[PDB]
Amino acid sequence: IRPFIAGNWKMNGTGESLGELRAIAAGISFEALICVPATLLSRAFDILGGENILLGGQNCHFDDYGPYTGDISAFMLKEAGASHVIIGHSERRTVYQESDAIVRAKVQAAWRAGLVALICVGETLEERKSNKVLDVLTRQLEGSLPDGATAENIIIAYEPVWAATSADVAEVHAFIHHKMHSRFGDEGAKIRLLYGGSVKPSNAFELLSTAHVNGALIGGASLKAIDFLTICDVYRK
Amino acid sequence: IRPFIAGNWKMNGTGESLGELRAIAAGISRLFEALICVPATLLSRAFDILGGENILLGGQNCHFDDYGPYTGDISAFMLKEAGASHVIIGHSERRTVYQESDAIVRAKVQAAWRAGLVALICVGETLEERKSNKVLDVLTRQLEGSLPDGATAENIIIAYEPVWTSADVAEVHAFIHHKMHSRFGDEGAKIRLLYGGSVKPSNAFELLSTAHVNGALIGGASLKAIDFLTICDVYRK
């Protein structure tokens, strides 16, 4: 499986940030993806569109178009230059009450538009404390993933919302990998599984060396090229 | 009071739509101001073609924070830097689906001001609220809670959405105008009040000539220049 390093800028980035984005790209010139705010996507594509780095969005709506003030369609992301979109991030599941059925509908829209969906799952502190980690993941993986998923059209990120040790991560990733084989067979075994908890240059070697971790979904350490590229450099070792 | 015609494209518009946006701008290019609020993905490209023109450009929502760990959200600073001067906040499509409270709306308005945006704040009652004869009670609460201290005729515009006639509209807009004078004094009497129910070329003269109606927030009829410009033409008569 080809490793995949995804950065999520979250609610950071304007035209002033394009230099930094170029620096991330030039450091790549594994696969790498940066997911920028929707306001910046077209301008990011204008400078990076040819280059090695992949460009993504951070959420999309379930419909192709329509009366949804303040929402962005998968088609809008695609036309602005995204190839990938994060869907079901913990920051949204909570605040925007995105249920697994809502997440599945968003994934289906992403595919209609030709995007790869980077689907996030993960249990809360109360859920882990209740000894419900595998029950939550069983439900979220089933409900969030539409029928028709392939190793080409989805990538999964595990977020330990409750926080994680590399043993904790190994246990979860093995569980998720078995789930993908159970539902999607041999092709399911090729679905990339990213660790999406705290990933920093200081813990990247240990986390990315872990069985069934096929990359990372990196938040704050994706905002500066020096951090992001130092994490990417682990694959040299 | 100078009249103000705002179009809300909602979740419609890509690069392919830039010709139609230009057609709107050229049709405006004396007695009123015009604003088009495009999806966040399109804003920078809209500014690139229209930034030196008469049309105002806006966004459709913003977050409460300046920046931060808010996947899929757009800050007021991002809108401003991409070329917006205005932002729609508290539209009924979001108050319902995303449970945007009056407190949440207030915090968004405050962010808009920090970034130097004019906040186009939407209020309005549900069908159930209208059926229960609670319209004025709901507007009293929404107007108090949604507007921060510090509002001026320069930094806010209010749109009334009957979420649920000219007599209905005159009564409501009179009430809203009086509430603005009550809280903000003489300056409050200068806050523009837009009607934002179904505004079409066929009802525009009657609606826009109503006392205390200072313009409109137009949805579907803003998607095509022919419809939008026909509504604007009312100020020539």
From Swiss-Prot, chain A:
Pfam families: TIM. SUPFAM superfamilies: Triosephosphate isomerase (TIM). It catalyses: D-glyceraldehyde 3-phosphate = dihydroxyacetone phosphate. Pathway: Carbohydrate biosynthesis; gluconeogenesis; Carbohydrate degradation; glycolysis; D-glyceraldehyde 3-phosphate from glycerone phosphate: step 1/1. It comes from the Bacteria. It is found in: Cytoplasm. The active site is at H89, E159. Its EC number is 5.3.1.1. PROSITE patterns: TIM_1 (PS00171), TIM_2 (PS51440). Keywords: Cytoplasm, Gluconeogenesis, Glycolysis, Isomerase. Gene3D superfamilies: Aldolase class I. The keyword Cytoplasm applies. One of its GO terms (biological process) is glyceraldehyde-3-phosphate biosynthetic process. PANTHER family: TRIOSEPHOSPHATE ISOMERASE. Belongs to the triosephosphate isomerase family. This is Triosephosphate isomerase. It comes from Bartonella henselae (strain ATCC 49882 / DSM 28221 / CCUG 30454 / Houston 1).
